[PDB]
Design an enzyme around this catalytic site. Structure first.
Site, mmCIF file in Angstrom:
data_model
loop_
_atom_site.group_PDB
_atom_site.id
_atom_site.type_symbol
_atom_site.label_atom_id
_atom_site.label_comp_id
_atom_site.label_asym_id
_atom_site.label_seq_id
_atom_site.Cartn_x
_atom_site.Cartn_y
_atom_site.Cartn_z
ATOM 1 N N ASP A 1 18.040 4.816 50.937
ATOM 2 C CA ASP A 1 16.902 4.631 50.038
ATOM 3 C C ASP A 1 16.436 3.166 49.874
ATOM 4 O O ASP A 1 16.112 2.721 48.771
ATOM 5 C CB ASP A 1 17.140 5.294 48.677
ATOM 6 C CG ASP A 1 15.843 5.657 47.974
ATOM 7 O OD1 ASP A 1 14.805 5.841 48.645
ATOM 8 O OD2 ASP A 1 15.866 5.764 46.742
ATOM 9 N N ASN B 1 14.217 -0.669 44.741
ATOM 10 C CA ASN B 1 15.675 -0.607 44.670
ATOM 11 C C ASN B 1 16.378 -1.929 44.915
ATOM 12 O O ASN B 1 17.601 -1.964 45.006
ATOM 13 C CB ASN B 1 16.208 0.466 45.624
ATOM 14 C CG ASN B 1 15.751 1.864 45.230
ATOM 15 O OD1 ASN B 1 15.248 2.054 44.124
ATOM 16 N ND2 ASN B 1 15.898 2.834 46.129
ATOM 17 N N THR C 1 12.464 7.970 50.583
ATOM 18 C CA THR C 1 11.087 7.772 50.144
ATOM 19 C C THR C 1 10.215 7.872 51.402
ATOM 20 O O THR C 1 10.398 7.134 52.366
ATOM 21 C CB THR C 1 10.930 6.377 49.444
ATOM 22 O OG1 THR C 1 11.845 6.291 48.346
ATOM 23 C CG2 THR C 1 9.535 6.167 48.914
ATOM 24 N N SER D 1 14.242 11.021 37.422
ATOM 25 C CA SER D 1 14.090 12.467 37.287
ATOM 26 C C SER D 1 15.051 13.137 36.330
ATOM 27 O O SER D 1 14.681 14.060 35.609
ATOM 28 C CB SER D 1 14.216 13.127 38.650
ATOM 29 O OG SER D 1 13.167 12.697 39.476
ATOM 30 N N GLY E 1 14.003 1.224 33.432
ATOM 31 C CA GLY E 1 13.476 2.026 34.515
ATOM 32 C C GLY E 1 13.709 3.497 34.233
ATOM 33 O O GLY E 1 14.606 3.892 33.469
ATOM 34 N N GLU F 1 26.120 -4.005 35.817
ATOM 35 C CA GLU F 1 25.754 -5.368 35.478
ATOM 36 C C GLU F 1 24.218 -5.466 35.331
ATOM 37 O O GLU F 1 23.475 -4.927 36.164
ATOM 38 C CB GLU F 1 26.247 -6.238 36.623
ATOM 39 C CG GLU F 1 26.116 -7.719 36.465
ATOM 40 C CD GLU F 1 26.482 -8.434 37.757
ATOM 41 O OE1 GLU F 1 26.192 -7.882 38.851
ATOM 42 O OE2 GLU F 1 27.080 -9.531 37.683
ATOM 43 N N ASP G 1 20.704 1.775 42.906
ATOM 44 C CA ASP G 1 20.354 3.120 43.337
ATOM 45 C C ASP G 1 21.062 3.687 44.551
ATOM 46 O O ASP G 1 20.443 3.915 45.597
ATOM 47 C CB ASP G 1 18.843 3.207 43.576
ATOM 48 C CG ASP G 1 18.030 2.699 42.387
ATOM 49 O OD1 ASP G 1 17.757 3.514 41.488
ATOM 50 O OD2 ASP G 1 17.661 1.497 42.344
ATOM 51 N N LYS H 1 13.994 0.197 49.734
ATOM 52 C CA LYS H 1 12.591 -0.018 49.351
ATOM 53 C C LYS H 1 12.605 -1.108 48.284
ATOM 54 O O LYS H 1 13.645 -1.318 47.651
ATOM 55 C CB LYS H 1 11.983 1.257 48.762
ATOM 56 C CG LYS H 1 12.813 1.927 47.633
ATOM 57 C CD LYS H 1 12.195 3.297 47.321
ATOM 58 C CE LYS H 1 12.778 3.896 46.082
ATOM 59 N NZ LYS H 1 12.114 5.179 45.694
#
Ligand SMILES: CNCCNS(=O)(=O)c1cccc2cnccc12
EC number: 2.7.11.11
Lengths: 20, 336
Positions: B152, B157, B187, B39, B36, B107, B170, B154
């Site tokens: 966060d 994540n 988000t 930024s 993944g 992990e 995250d 979503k």
């Protein structure tokens, strides 16, 4: 349908978080 | 539960005060593939040469973190992650830094993002969605109990493990706060009205985000969506939600309480706290203890062919790892 509208939309991929 | 959490807080507090530091070196791992991207870095599937074990190593470029003003949030992520311990949270195994970057070795969760499966599949059945929601419910209950806000939630994540269970990753916006907070975080699609309205908030934003999750899982799309964030912000503060015709009644009402603009009427933020959610009709069949113990029937198991298999993850261009001759942001990240 809403689903179709979503599929044609620009935000179907991974969404980034907003910082500044 | 209250009893459980009490013990839990004690463990978290020990680590909170005495966070671990530099528990490894970059050269102990073998870089394999990017799982993944972000930024200020990327997450790489790596292998611990001494143990033969695989992990997901998050790499943060110190200069980009500073340029983007994410130092404190970065300090929060690591400090919190090394102190927490729950069945649905990723485990931070090691962390270290060098002249150029910050590293968090966690992990490896082989199942892939919930996002990619939801997208491919379309939508999840209520039973399937509830299986997942319940896990997030127990997680927020655990996190909030420790004065933490996630910020966060979503599909991107949430990772699926070998057992079909969730692993929340995250923690870049996670914050231990007693009282209100003001950062514009998250988000767009999952932002609570208070956040977009710049009014200062608390844990209740995590409960609004949960409502957004359950809805996206069950319908296949978010309750508020547009092509540009501002159009989205508009919809969120509008206080109007339309539900797919297939949503059960118990679901339309659980969701109407979670997506309550008025956070003094929002489930999770009421008098009975999380119980208002656990005791909701939509969850009447859910055996919370069973789910916590992972003894429940997972509706879907992503299958992976042997260790190191990364087929449930998307391909990314491999940006190469660089490390300066000179230490880069020493004082900013001294506690890392
Ligand atoms: C962008 N959402 C993060 C999901 N994938 S990731 O590569 O960042 C990622 C981050 C943290 C732990 C992981 C464990 N296994 C696989 C991937 C992991």
């Amino acid at each position: 349908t809403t689903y179709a509208d979503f599929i044609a939309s620009g935000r179907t991929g991974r969404r980034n978080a907003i910082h500044d | 539960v209250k009893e459980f959490l009490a013990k839990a807080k004690e463990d978290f507090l020990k680590k909170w005060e005495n966070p671990a530091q530099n528990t490894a070196h970059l050269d102990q791992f073998e870089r394999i593939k990017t799982l993944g991207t972000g930024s200020f870095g990327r997450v790489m599937l790596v292998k611990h040469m001494e143990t033969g074990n695989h992990y997901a190593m998050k790499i943060l470029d110190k200069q980009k973190v500073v340029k983007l003003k994410q130092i404190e949030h970065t300090l929060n992520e690591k400090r919190i992650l090394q102190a927490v311990n729950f069945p649905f949270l990723v485990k931070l195994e090691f962390s270290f830094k060098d002249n150029s970057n910050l590293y968090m070795v966690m992990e490896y969760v082989a199942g892939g993002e919930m996002f990619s499966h939801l997208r491919r599949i379309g939508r999840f059945s209520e039973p399937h969605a509830r299986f997942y929601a319940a896990q997030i419910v127990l997680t927020f209950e655990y996190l909030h109990s420790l004065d933490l806000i996630y910020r966060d939630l979503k599909p991107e994540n949430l990772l699926i493990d070998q057992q079909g269970y969730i692993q929340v990753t995250d923690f870049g916006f996670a914050k231990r706060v007693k009282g209100r907070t003001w950062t514009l975080c998250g988000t767009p699609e999952y932002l609570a009205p208070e956040i977009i309205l710049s009014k200062g908030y608390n844990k209740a934003v995590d409960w609004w985000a949960l409502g957004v999750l359950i809805y996206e899982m069950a319908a296949g799309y978010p309750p508020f969506f547009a092509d540009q964030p501002i159009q989205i912000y508009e919809k969120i503060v509008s206080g109007k939600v339309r539900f797919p015709s297939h949503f059960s009644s118990d679901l339309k009402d659980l969701l109407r309480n979670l997506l309550q603009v008025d956070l003094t009427k929002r489930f999770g933020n009421l008098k009975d706290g999380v119980n208002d959610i656990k005791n909701h009709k939509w969850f009447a069949t859910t055996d919370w203890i069973a789910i916590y113990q992972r003894k429940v029937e997972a509706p879907f198991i992503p299958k992976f062919k042997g260790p190191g298999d990364t087929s449930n993850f998307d391909d990314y261009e491999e940006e190469e790892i660089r490390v300066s001759i000179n230490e880069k942001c020493g004082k900013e990240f001294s506690e890392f």
